[PDB]
């Protein structure tokens, strides 16, 4: 059946029993950078399993009032195994991420998550005049929550309706998107390839994409149901190739 899925990228494996078809990012499977499309002359470091494995990020509780969360990849993968180590020790890096968001909910739970990988989701500042610091959008440890309404200050505009990029969140399905509907789905897998203008880019200054998990239907459970419904992102970079060995950047 299509509901069952098993992804064995690297050492870590993910097995699911209610998971719809995995959304290959824009219909193209990730692969190593070809010689035709390569602009860096350094020898590419290609750990097939050291870095191309499923990294389980911090699980965030999907509350009833939770408007959404976002992870900024690949910067959200800092301090996460040898992928983060290679990020630190390389000037240029390319990876195709097969994000797998796990939301285990019972048959009595009402809710739906748009798990969408937005390539280059330029976030808007809460105050348009200024620019937010890096901490406001970076997702090194915890997902950055979209606010239900407008916020102010030197932060990221977290209005869920505008998805933080001045863009209609309902139209976010234009990007590689999968829906975790607790009626049917408990996990969404998006195999997003390396998406950038330059064939390889630095993994700190530039975030290749943002995984936005937007609860369009808020979690609705009657009393007695599990209140701590976790939204666990398990992202596995695929065909990760790095050029430009350098001093570790911290």
């Amino acid at each position: 059946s299509d509901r069952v899925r098993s992804m064995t990228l690297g050492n870590s494996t993910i097995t699911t029993q209610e998971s719809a078809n995995v959304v290959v990012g824009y219909g193209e499977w990730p692969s190593y950078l070809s010689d035709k499309e390569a602009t860096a002359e350094d020898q590419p470091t290609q750990p097939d399993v050291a870095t191309c494995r499923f990294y389980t990020l911090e699980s965030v509780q999907w509350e009833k009032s939770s408007p959404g969360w976002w992870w900024k990849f690949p910067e959200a993968l800092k301090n996460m195994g040898l992928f983060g180590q290679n990020m630190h020790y390389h000037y240029l890096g390319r990876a195709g991420y097969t994000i797998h968001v796990q939301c285990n909910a019972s048959k009595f739970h009402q809710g739906c998550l748009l798990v969408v990988c937005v390539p280059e989701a330029e976030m808007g500042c809460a105050d348009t005049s200024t620019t937010f610091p890096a901490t406001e959008l970076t997702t090194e440890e915890e997902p950055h929550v979209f606010t239900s309404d407008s916020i102010t200050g030197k932060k990221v505009q977290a209005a869920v309706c505008n998805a933080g990029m001045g863009v209609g969140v309902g139209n976010l399905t234009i990007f590689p998107h999968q829906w975790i509907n607790l009626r049917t789905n408990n996990s969404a897998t998006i195999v997003m390839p390396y998406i950038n203008s330059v064939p390889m880019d630095n993994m700190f200054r530039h975030y290749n994409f943002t995984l936005m998990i937007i609860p369009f239907a808020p979690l609705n459970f009657n009393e007695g149901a599990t209140a701590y419904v976790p939204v666990t992102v398990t992202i596995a970079p695929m065909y990760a190739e790095y050029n430009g060995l350098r001093l570790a950047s911290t």
């Binding site: 280059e120 330029e122 001045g166 863009v167 399905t173 590689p176 829906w179 950038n196």
Partner: protein, 269 residues
């Protein structure tokens, strides 16, 4: 090149359930009106022409309007060359993250003859030098500085009253595409300029009057129109519902998802 024709359909009671799909899959249903309902054989001579990104960007739109005067820095117009200055073409270009387009600039310049106490002196036809300084190149500080000597900088040297100047520009981005959206900082420390301002630094456009001076102040308006051609859109994005606030960042004021209607059941007319 026409769109797919509506295949003839009929009554059906089967297990195919074409209407029944799953958005949980993330795959938009490929169903046709023949699938859900019963449709006649309609040959769709309609074509997805003028909806092509090549045709959609074919419509030339303004990207830079500035007023530079004749007889300081107000005698020539400086443009940090970006599509984002004007919202009309910016949202078109912001429909896609990466667009590899050869951009066809068509400068439209109209002299204003600023209202003054004395305007009885007629100046000959005003020639206009639209110089392009590549990023990192010598930026002029005066209307008669050495930078205006176009040893390498392209310049139309358009004269007023003729056909509007037009110099097609190739794909000049250092990367393999123009990143209209770039959620990345300028510096690897993740501190600096966040947004398209980092990667989309394609130089500057300095517009001046080739005429040295005029008896009376004349403030010609340079209206730069950017026509993308040979476009390669690569990552589609939704239009920005919120009005554009900054031309160097995506910063926005919150806006409603749509025009609110009185009720979920409110259908006008």
């Amino acid at each position: 090149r026409t769109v797919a024709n509506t295949q003839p359909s009929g009554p059906s009671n089967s297990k195919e359930i074409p209407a029944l799909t799953a958005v949980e899959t993330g795959h938009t249903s490929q169903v046709d009106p023949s699938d859900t309902l019963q449709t006649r054989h309609v040959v769709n001579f309609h074509s997805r022409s003028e909806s092509t990104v090549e045709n959609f960007m074919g419509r030339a739109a303004c990207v830079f309007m500035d007023q530079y005067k004749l007889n300081s820095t107000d005698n020539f117009a400086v443009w940090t060359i970006n599509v984002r200055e004007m919202a009309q073409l910016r949202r078109k270009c912001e429909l896609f993250t990466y667009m590899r387009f050869d951009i066809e600039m068509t400068m439209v310049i109209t002299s204003c003859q600023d209202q003054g106490t004395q305007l009885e002196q007629d100046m000959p036809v005003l020639t206009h030098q639209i110089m392009y300084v590549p990023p990192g190149g010598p930026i002029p500080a005066k209307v008669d500085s050495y930078e205006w000597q176009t040893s390498t900088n392209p310049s139309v040297f358009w004269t007023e009253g003729n056909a509007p100047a037009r110099m097609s520009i190739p794909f000049i981005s250092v990367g393999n595409a123009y990143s209209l959206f770039y959620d990345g900082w300028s510096h690897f420390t993740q501190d600096g300029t966040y947004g398209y301002t980092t990667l989309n630094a394609m130089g500057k456009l300095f517009v001046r009057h080739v005429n040295k001076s005029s008896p009376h102040q004349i403030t010609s308006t340079i209206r730069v129109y950017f026509k993308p051609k040979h476009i390669k859109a690569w990552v589609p994005r939704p239009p920005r519902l919120c009005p554009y606030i900054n031309k160097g960042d995506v910063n926005f004021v919150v806006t409603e998802v749509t025009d609110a209607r009185k009720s979920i059941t409110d259908t006008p007319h």
